[PDB]
Amino acid sequence: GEYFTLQIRGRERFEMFRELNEALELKDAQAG
Amino acid sequence: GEYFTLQIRGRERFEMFRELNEALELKDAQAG
Amino acid sequence: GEYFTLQIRGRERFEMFRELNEALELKDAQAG
Amino acid sequence: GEYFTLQIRGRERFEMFRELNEALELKDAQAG
For residues B26 and D23, the answer to whether their CB atoms sit within 8 Å is yes
Contacts of C22 in chain A (CB under 8 A): 27
Q: What is the DSSP letter of A1?
A: -
The answer to whether the Cβ–Cβ distance between A26 and C30 falls below 8 Å is yes
For residues C24 and C15, the answer to whether their CB atoms sit within 8 Å is no
For residues C3 and D8, the answer to whether their CB atoms sit within 8 Å is yes
User: What was the experiment behind these coordinates?
Assistant: X-ray
SS3 assignment, position C1: coil
Chain C neighbours (≥3 Cβ pairs under 8 A) are: A, D
Alpha-carbon gap, residue D32 to A17, rounded angstroms: 29
Q: What is the resolution of this structure in A?
A: 1.7
Residue B4, Ramachandran bin (φ over 0: left; ψ between -120 and 50: alpha; else beta): beta
Residue D5 φ/ψ, nearest 5 degrees: -120, 145
For chain C, say whether D27 makes contact (Cβ under 8 Å): no
CA B16 to mean position of chain CA atoms: 9
Alpha-carbon gap, residue D5 to C7, rounded angstroms: 4
For chain D, say whether C1 makes contact (Cβ under 8 Å): yes
Cβ count within 10 A of residue B24: 23
Beta strand ranges found along chain D (DSSP E): 3-9
The answer to whether the Cβ–Cβ distance between C6 and D14 falls below 8 Å is yes
Spell out the residues 6+ positions from residue D6 whose beta carbon is closer than 8 angstroms to its own: C5, C6, C8, C14, C17, C18, C21, D17
Residue B31 φ/ψ, nearest 5 degrees: -135, 45
The answer to whether the Cβ–Cβ distance between B6 and A8 falls below 8 Å is yes
The answer to whether the Cβ–Cβ distance between C23 and A19 falls below 8 Å is no
Cα pseudo-dihedral D21, A11, B27, C8, rounded to 10? 0
CA C31 to mean position of chain CA atoms: 18
Alpha-carbon gap, residue A12 to B1, rounded angstroms: 10
